[PDB]
């Protein structure tokens, strides 16, 4: 029976491949060739944030485009005021091996975790004025690689056990498990309407998940190695991924096909992080060469670079409004560009 | 009237920065160690004689050591291995001797040592269960490592009294198998410190201490162009 089920799976895979070929009338590169290029982009560092001692693994912008949360390997989260560069909080962690963090859209909570397989949720707004742990979420058996906030009572996490999960923060119980990956899950991204999310994994694939049903709606392939970063397009009908093969790819959720490849002969390093600008025209990615390249998302041309790091770039993000891009690296510094 | 809020933020930084300075001193004086080993490794004994991650703290001669043991993580090491790229040392425990467990250990060590992020991290290597190797050999290596048939005891070998020369050859053969990998790939940035220990031995606590010292000393000697 096993050989026949395998043959059936191969037949379905071939049917899917032909179904996708049937829609491949033209590539993106044959349409946007009539669009003027963005030209040279020269961003400059405006502010530098100092205080972490260990390599910084995660950074996330809040919804007011004014506060940042960052996490280093020391066991400390720092809340920063990007405008005045002043610190707001410095939260000690139970363990130093923190790999991800997230800022709640309400500004009330901060989530983080990593090798302890526990997602810790801190309440930043308490009557005593002291930051306290409000919840510890546990169930995941592998390391925690990414956390995202849907609402104050709902959080989406991913772990190294190939399973994503939706947690009910107030009750502390896991409510939805998303399975089907075979490698570690590296990065999550939520849809603008937070009904769908996409999960990239160390399988050279990504999956489009239905937040409400618990069903995996689409599976995307195309990368040659492990996927390290994923980011939804501003419109919500496409996402960009980065992998260890030194290529970045844009996928279309409505055509279930790869749409564009971003690569260069001189780039042989993986892509630690991927992010889009407010208009979706610029794609930014951090590399292992201690820099960041800004790509024209509609042309696959390089628009410019962000150089100012001496160690691996670990994270990148853009403000909701679009006024600034912030990055972090293993140098224990955060920088803001303009 | 907005100056009152700005003043308040300055006060917060003063409180935070002073605490960070205190914490920074504690951070630099603490030596972090990563503990890895074979599935049959006596890793528990390694801990006793000294979730997804466990922490053990030691104070050895007024020096604070922090050892992290990998808990219930997936067998795929290539992603969390990068995180431990700034520890003082990696302690790798291999049991000598059903698959060819030694080849797996040698396979793993080769992969670790040549990792692009671990090029400056030294490895302290413990070879455990010496009595099982000794009994197996005196009671086979050539069926797994044919070159052992032509191996001779190093001229600088210092075996304990009472050891069977066949056992001493097996121990040095295995040690040399690890050392050839370390020597061939190393470029003076990090070193391997192999040791031959017993399953139960409290002396291991000083072996790590002394090795950590030498690692740091040679690091500084490299910096000052003396070594």
């Amino acid at each position: 029976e096993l050989d026949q089920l395998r043959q059936e799976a191969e037949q379905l895979k071939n049917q899917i491949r032909d179904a996708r070929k049937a829609c491949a009338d033209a590539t993106l590169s044959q349409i946007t060739n009539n669009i003027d290029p963005v030209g040279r982009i020269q961003m400059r560092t405006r502010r530098t944030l100092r205080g972490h001692l260990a390599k910084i693994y995660a950074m996330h912008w809040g919804t007011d485009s004014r506060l940042l949360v960052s996490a280093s390997q020391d066991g400390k989260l720092i809340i920063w005021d990007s405008y005045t560069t002043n610190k707001v909080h410095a939260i000690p962690l139970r363990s130093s091996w923190v790999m991800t963090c997230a800022y709640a859209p309400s500004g009330n909570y901060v989530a983080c975790g990593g090798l302890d397989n526990i997602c810790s949720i801190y309440n930043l707004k308490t009557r005593e004025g002291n930051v306290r742990v409000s919840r510890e979420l546990a169930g995941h058996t592998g390391y925690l690689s990414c956390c995202r906030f849907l609402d104050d009572n709902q959080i989406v996490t991913s772990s190294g056990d190939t399973t994503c999960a939706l947690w009910d923060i107030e009750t502390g119980q896991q409510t939805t498990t998303f399975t089907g990956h075979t490698g570690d899950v590296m990065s999550l991204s939520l849809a603008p309407d937070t009904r769908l999310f996409v999960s990239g994994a160390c399988d050279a694939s990504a999956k489009l998940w239905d937040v409400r049903e618990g069903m995996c709606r689409q599976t995307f392939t195309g990368h040659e190695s492990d996927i390290n970063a994923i980011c939804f397009f501003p419109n919500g009908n496409a996402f960009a991924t980065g992998s260890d093969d030194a290529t970045c790819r844009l996928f279309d959720l409505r055509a279930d096909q790869e749409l564009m490849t971003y690569s260069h002969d001189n780039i042989i390093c993986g892509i630690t992080s991927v992010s889009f600008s407010k208009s979706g025209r610029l794609l930014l990615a951090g590399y292992d060469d201690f820099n960041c390249n800004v790509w024209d998302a509609l042309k696959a041309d390089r628009a410019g670079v962000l150089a100012g790091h001496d160690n691996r770039v670990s994270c990148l993000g853009v403000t909701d409004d679009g006024m600034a891009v912030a990055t972090g690296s293993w140098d224990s510094f955060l920088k803001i560009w303009n | 009237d907005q100056r009152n809020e700005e003043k308040a933020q300055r006060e917060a930084n003063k409180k935070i920065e002073k605490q960070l300075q205190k914490d920074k001193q504690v951070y630099r004086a603490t030596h972090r160690l990563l503990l890895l080993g074979a599935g049959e490794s006596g890793k528990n004994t390694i801990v006793k004689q000294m979730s997804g991650i466990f922490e053990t703290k030691f104070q050895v001669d007024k020096v604070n050591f922090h050892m992290f043991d990998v808990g219930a993580q997936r067998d795929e090491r290539r992603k969390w291995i990068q995180c431990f790229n700034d520890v003082t040392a990696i302690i790798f425990v291999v049991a000598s001797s059903q698959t060819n467990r030694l080849q797996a250990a040698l396979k793993l060590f080769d992969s670790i040592w040549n990792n692009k992020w671990l090029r400056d991290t030294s490895v302290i290597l413990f070879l455990n269960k010496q009595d099982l190797l000794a009994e197996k050999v005196l009671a086979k290596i050539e069926d797994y490592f044919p070159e052992f048939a032509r191996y001779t005891t190093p001229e600088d070998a210092t075996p304990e009294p009472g050891e069977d020369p066949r056992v001493t050859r097996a121990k040095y053969f295995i040690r040399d198998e690890f050392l050839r990998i370390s020597t061939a790939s190393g470029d003076g940035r990090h070193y391997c410190y192999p040791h031959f220990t017993c399953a139960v031995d409290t002396e291991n606590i000083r072996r790590v201490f002394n090795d950590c010292r030498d690692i740091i000393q040679r690091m500084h000697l490299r910096q000052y162009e003396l070594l």
Partner: nanobody, 126 residues
């Protein structure tokens, strides 16, 4: 999507030989190190051979030295294995496996848990 499909298996008598193959797709073959691993009927996966991207450096487990050889052809994306002087001890399912990243020399591909860049394997009964 990347695939590895083994071939050239079968049953042979002691002292005989086989030539195994492995077709790769979905990635640039010449940029990756390739390995052969075996699954023993009652034992966990064991590494057998490791060939570098250029074919300049080939490593074998000690138990197969002088009996097994490997090669690759980057113009065909094909990895081979010559299995000579076989003994009952060599009965196993053989898998062709790829190192997780290009342009590197560190590999973790004999994991018990489902490995993403491993083929289905071919049974070599002796």
């Amino acid at each position: 999507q990347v695939q590895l499909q083994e071939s050239g298996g079968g049953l042979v008598q002691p002292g005989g030989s086989l030539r195994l193959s492995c077709a790769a797709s979905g990635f640039t073959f010449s940029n990756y190190k390739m390995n052969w691993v075996r699954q023993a009927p009652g034992k966990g996966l064991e590494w057998v051979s490791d060939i570098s991207q250029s074919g300049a450096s080939i490593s074998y487990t000690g138990s197969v030295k002088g009996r097994f050889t490997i090669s690759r052809d980057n113009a065909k994306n094909t990895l081979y294995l010559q299995m000579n002087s076989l003994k009952p001890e060599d009965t196993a399912v053989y898998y062709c496996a790829r190192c997780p990243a290009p342009f590197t020399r560190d590999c973790f591909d004999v994991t018990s848990t489902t490995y993403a860049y491993r083929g289905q394997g071919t049974q070599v009964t002796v």
